[PDB]
Amino acid sequence: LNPEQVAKIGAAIDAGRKYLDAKIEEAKKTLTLRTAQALLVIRSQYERAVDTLFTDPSAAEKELAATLATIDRLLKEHPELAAEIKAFIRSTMAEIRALLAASLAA
Amino acid sequence: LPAQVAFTPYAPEPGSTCRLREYYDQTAQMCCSKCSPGQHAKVFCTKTSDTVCDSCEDSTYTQLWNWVPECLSCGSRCSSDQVETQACTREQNRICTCRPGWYCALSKQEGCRLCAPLRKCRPGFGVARPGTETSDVVCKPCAPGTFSNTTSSTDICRPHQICNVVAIPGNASMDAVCT
Numbered sequence: 204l205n206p207e208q209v210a211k212i213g214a215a216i217d218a219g220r221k222y223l224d225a226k227i228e229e230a231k232k233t234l235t236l237r238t239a240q241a242l243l244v245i246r247s248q249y250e251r252a253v254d255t256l257f258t259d260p261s262a263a264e265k266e267l268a269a270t271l272a273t274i275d276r277l278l279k280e281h282p283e284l285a286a287e288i289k290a291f292i293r294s295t296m297a298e299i300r301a302l303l304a305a306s307l308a309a
Numbered sequence: 310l311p312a313q314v315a316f317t318p319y320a321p322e323p324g325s326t327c328r329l330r331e332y333y334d335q336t337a338q339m340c341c342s343k344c345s346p347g348q349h350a351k352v353f354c355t356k357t358s359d360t361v362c363d364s365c366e367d368s369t370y371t372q373l374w375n376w377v378p379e380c381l382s383c384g385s386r387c388s389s390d391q392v393e394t395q396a397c398t399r400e401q402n403r404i405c406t407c408r409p410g411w412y413c414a415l416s417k418q419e420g421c422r423l424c425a426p427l428r429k430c431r432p433g434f435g436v437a438r439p440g441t442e443t444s445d446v447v448c449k450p451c452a453p454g455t456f457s458n459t460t461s462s463t464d465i466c467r468p469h470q471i472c473n474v475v476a477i478p479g480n481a482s483m484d485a486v487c488t
Contacts, residue, residue, distance in 0.1 A: 206445075209414050209423075216415070236335060237353065240377045247381035250417065254385035257415065257423045258405075262385070277378055 208306045212299055216253055219295035223249060226288065238284070241277035248273050249292060256299060267296055317342045317359045332376060343374040347399040350376040365399040372401055384417065390424050410462065413443045427462045432482035435466030451481040458483055 204212070223246045230239035252266035271289050278285035310316060317331055318339035327333050327340035334341040334354055341354035344362035349371055352361035365371060369380035383397035387405035395404035404420040407413050413421035427440045430448035435457040438447035451457055451466035456479055469479035472487035479485035 204414070204423075204425075213415055234335060237378070241379075244377055244379045244381055251382040251385050254417075254422045258385045258388040258391075266385070273379070 204306050208302060212302050215295055215298045215302070219249060219253070219292060220246070222291050222295075223288070226284075238278070238281065242288075244277060245270070245274055245288060252296070253299070256296075256303065263300075267292075318354045318356065330374060334376075341376070343376055344371070345374060346371055348375075349380045350378055353378075367399075368397060370397065370399055370402055384420070384422075391421065394420070407442070412440050412445050416443050429460045429462050430457065430464065431460050432458050433480075436461075436463055439463065453481075454479075456481055456483055 223242060227239050227242045227246070230236065230242060248266075248270045252263065252270045255262045255266045270292060274285055274288050274292070278288065318334070318337055318341045320338060321327060321333065321340050330343055331340045332343050333339075337354050337356050339354060339356060342360045342362070344350050344360060347370070348362040348364055350360050351363040352358075353376070354360045360376060365380035368383050370383055371377060371380050380399070381402070384403045384405065386397075386403070387393045390408075390411070391405040392408055393403065394406045395401060397403035402419065405422070407421050407424035411424045411426050413423070414425040415421070415423035425445070428446045428448060430436055430446065433451060433456075434448045435451050435455070436446055437449040438444075440446040440462060446462045449466070455466040455468050457464055457466050466481075469485045470487065472485065474488040475485055476488040477486035
């Protein structure tokens with residue numbers, strides 16, 4: 204990875220983290236604190252799933268699956284919100300994986 | 310506990326806060342027990358039942374007295390490039406860091422998810438900005454009058470020696486030789 208690729212990869216990771224933090228702040232502003240608590244857990248698993256792309260790529264798809272299952276489980280009673288978070292996290296991880304594959308292929 | 314001492318869950322009297330190990334739950338409108346570090350709220354309190362706290366499973370944690378519905382995931386195990394400066398336990402997250410001579414290319418809130426070796430400025434080049442925990446060394450070519458004869462992440466461009474009668478002039482990678 205050259206500095207340009209790392210910067211693009213970091214920007215994608217920050218986008219997912221910042222989206223999750225905004226969803227937490229939104230749950231706090233609307234006083235849906237039990238949802239804010241669930242989002243903290245989902246954020247922690249997102250961070251682990253991102254870590255694994257760099258520390259152990261052979262585990263990445265399993266950690267992504269565990270992220271989406273955690274969203275499904277914790278937000279089972281808020282399906283609209285659950286769909287928004289899965290879609291942001293899926294799209295974010297697709298972009299990071301795309302940048303990684305493109306750098307390893309050069 | 311005797312009849313004198315209120316148990317959770319209870320509604321706090323006007324002018325009160327909840328006890329130290331309690332939080333005010335807005336859904337029950339009651340003071341309810343928090344769970345300890347290493348546990349989480351398996352079941353939230355209601356108006357008639359207290360929080361149910363269960364232990365975190367391996368590779369998850371809670372660092373504070375809490376009422377999260379599941380424990381948080383530890384960060385992934387460190388790669389061989391990194392050093393694990395804090396272990397994952399049921400009460401604390403894993404922290405991975407970079408070795409001396411390396412910087413953190415992708416930083417986490419705590420620690421690092423990707424380390425990279427610091428650049429070394431070759432002879433003729435000196436350190437312009439030193440490396441930091443999260444940033445690579447920046448090099449510069451040595452301007453006339455200065456030099457660097459080493460390959461190094463810390464050595465800077467240093468002045469040529471002064472002398473009136475030059476046998477061999479100095480350049481960017483070697484000192485002047487004086488007669």
